[PDB]
Amino acid sequence: AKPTVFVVDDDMSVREGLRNLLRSAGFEVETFDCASTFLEHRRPEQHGCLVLDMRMPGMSGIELQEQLTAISDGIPIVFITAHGDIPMTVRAMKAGAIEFLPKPFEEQALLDAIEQGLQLNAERRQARETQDQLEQLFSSLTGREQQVLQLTIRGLMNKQIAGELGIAEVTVKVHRHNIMQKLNVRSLANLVHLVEKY
Ligand SMILES: [Hg+2]
Ligand SMILES: [Hg+2]
Ligand SMILES: [Hg+2]
Ligand SMILES: [Mg+2]
Missing domain, CATH: 1.10.10.10 (Winged helix-like DNA-binding domain superfamily/Winged helix DNA-binding domain)
Incomplete structure (x- = not known):
């Protein structure tokens, strides 16, 4: 499928700034100002990378990640935050974090993380499709x-x-x-x- 970057952040400048940055790089982009609108739209077959704000109305970024963990949606996450003083938890890191980046971010640092994420998504999905194909043949x-x-x-x-x-x-x-x-x-x-x- 098309490489899609999902951007989840309540702040309009972040959503628009990233939509523009990511389009100017060949990615499809989807943005949500809430975690639950993302989860509602999320299809685990869609190839992509999640760029995710720590603090938003409703579920926080970690809380959304917990949902994705719970349902085995292995989409890679680049966490972004305006409060770099508050570290990621060990559990948040283990659950598919590519990188933890400050807002405002270095454009290139963000792009490198997303490229890393897309490759890890491509790989993960291939190992999913293969196991799926082989269970149907063997069954x-x-x-x-x-x-x-x-x-x-x-x-x-x-x-x-x-x-x-x-x-x-x-x-x-x-x-x-x-x-x-x-x-x-x-x-x-x-x-x-x-x-x-x-
Ligand atoms: Hg929302
Ligand atoms: Hg919707
Ligand atoms: Hg991606
Ligand atoms: Mg926020």
């Missing part, structure tokens, strides 16, 4: 096929698999053919990689 196998797969990745020959399970060799052959097609692999090497991957 599409029958119990019988599962039994054959388990022995196959143990290096057994069809003859030995047949004897172990009490089925005909042709039955094993056919199960093996169907496993390859279901899991979309053309070699025993790639079959074993896939099972280990998942």
